Design a protein around this ligand. Sequence first.
Ligand SMILES: CCCCNS(=O)(=O)c1ccccc1
Ligand SMILES: CCCCNS(=O)(=O)c1ccccc1
Length: 122
Amino acid sequence: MSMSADQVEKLAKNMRKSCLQKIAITEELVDGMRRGEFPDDHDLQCYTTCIMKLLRTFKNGNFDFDMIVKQLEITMPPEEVVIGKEIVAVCRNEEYTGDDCQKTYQYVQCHYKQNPEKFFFP
Ligand SMILES: CCCCNS(=O)(=O)c1ccccc1
Ligand SMILES: CCCCNS(=O)(=O)c1ccccc1
């Protein structure tokens, strides 16, 4: 089964808390991504890697697309799952370059670009 909205929010907030402290950036900077604010800020980039590593969606220098699909299946509203799979289907085929922080940040931006209105990142 899938997790309820409030359980998704709780886990996201706790992952954020952990990574914000570790990476030493502000909540404002993380919240900016949902507003389409993607500065070339290496610390924000590394925050994205911290979160994806927690979710097991990035590991050993590469995306784990099987786990990205599993995570979206367990956390998205059911009426959004197919649309989410279609976003992953597009973004998985873009080349990601640079260090791990740069790669995950680029992937997150690809997700945003496919649907800015509904974008969410912990
Ligand atoms: C908003 C609904 C989609 C959430 N998906 S998530 O991968 O960001 C995620 C968030 C929180 C816990 C686990 C995964
Ligand atoms: C798409 C939701 C499942 C994957 N979760 S994620 O945190 O890696 C993530 C990557 C990119 C955008 C949002 C969340």
